[PDB]
């Protein structure tokens, strides 16, 4: 995803905030990595990038990796808003407004949460991109991929 500069630190186990609380919850036992790199050219133009939207409020803190794509009307008052945007009614969608000369705390930052999930399944995704050569006719140590 692409977020503000200041919301990168929120993407971390045991942290709070706005994106970490109401956009994407990193569990306290999150396994993997968070990688944030700048895409100020790739995202922000002089006119602004407005295909990105971020949630700011939700009924409760989002569960770890629980996704809420719905644009539902939020009711936390005395009477419901019945779909329309009325009094004490906010649409939970707002765009960042990326610009190419933005301050470091507001430039479009690509944050990627590479999560590793282990369940009662095989390790069907691995990273064994490490091979030697194959020199022969010597008493050597060999390991043909677990062999």
């Amino acid at each position, epitope marked *: 995803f692409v977020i503000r500069g200041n919301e990168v630190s929120q993407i971390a186990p045991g942290q709070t905030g706005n994106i970490a609380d109401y956009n994407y919850k990193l569990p306290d036992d999150f396994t993997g990595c968070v990688i944030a790199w700048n895409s100020n050219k790739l995202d922000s133009t*002089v*006119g*602004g990038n*407005y295909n990105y*939207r971020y949630r700011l409020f939700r009924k409760s803190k989002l569960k770890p990796f629980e996704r809420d794509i719905s644009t539902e009307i939020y009711q936390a008052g005395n009477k419901p808003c019945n779909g329309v945007a009325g009094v004490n009614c906010y*649409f939970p*969608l*707002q*765009s960042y*407004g990326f*610009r190419p000369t933005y301050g470091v705390g507001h430039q479009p930052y690509r944050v990627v949460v590479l999560s590793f999930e282990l369940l009662h399944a095989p390790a069907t995704v691995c990273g064994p991109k490490k091979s030697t050569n194959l020199v022969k006719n010597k008493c050597v140590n060999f390991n043909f991929n677990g062999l």
Partner: antibody
Amino acid sequence: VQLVESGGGLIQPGGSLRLSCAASGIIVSRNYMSWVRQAPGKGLEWVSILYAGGSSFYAEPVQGRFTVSRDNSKNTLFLEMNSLRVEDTAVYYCARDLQWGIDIWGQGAMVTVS
Amino acid sequence: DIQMTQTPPSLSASVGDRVSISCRASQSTGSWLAWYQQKPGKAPKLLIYKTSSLESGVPSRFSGSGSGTEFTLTISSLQPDDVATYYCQHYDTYSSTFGQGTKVEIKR
């Protein structure tokens, strides 16, 4: 689509400053036009908005002091502010607003009250 | 309904200054005026209840005071974090209202 802001400057407390904002690439009479001031060191403060139908809504702190308007012939957003307080100084942005919220901002106009 | 004011509309002072703001109403309340603080982009935080006793966590520099139509908020020392909007909040079992607020900023 660009929003060029001008008229922001230094004004004594309780004074009156008039902010102009040329709009290019779109007609503001058919667009929500909001004034969102970001205080230096603080966040954006969506203080004023004028719909496409001529209806205007103002934040209570600026309500009764700030009026939002437009010149359709000049296609220029206009913020008329009076009885300014010391707390009104900010980088104001005239901004297009849509269903997803604000869509196009400006280069920024510096308004200082002291 | 409820129409009460605060004074001054704009306040400016340096670090360590004393702050005495006022909330005033046309009639007598006696038992139900409170003080709250709000910063740009944040929710109100209760400062004073009963206009004389400090809410839990509100610093000794902060102090309500006053009686009658007027309500004198005495911040014993204006710290930078005290720079915010001060609202008189009123309790009632129905609609109620929020005040205009006293917006204190840095004098320069």
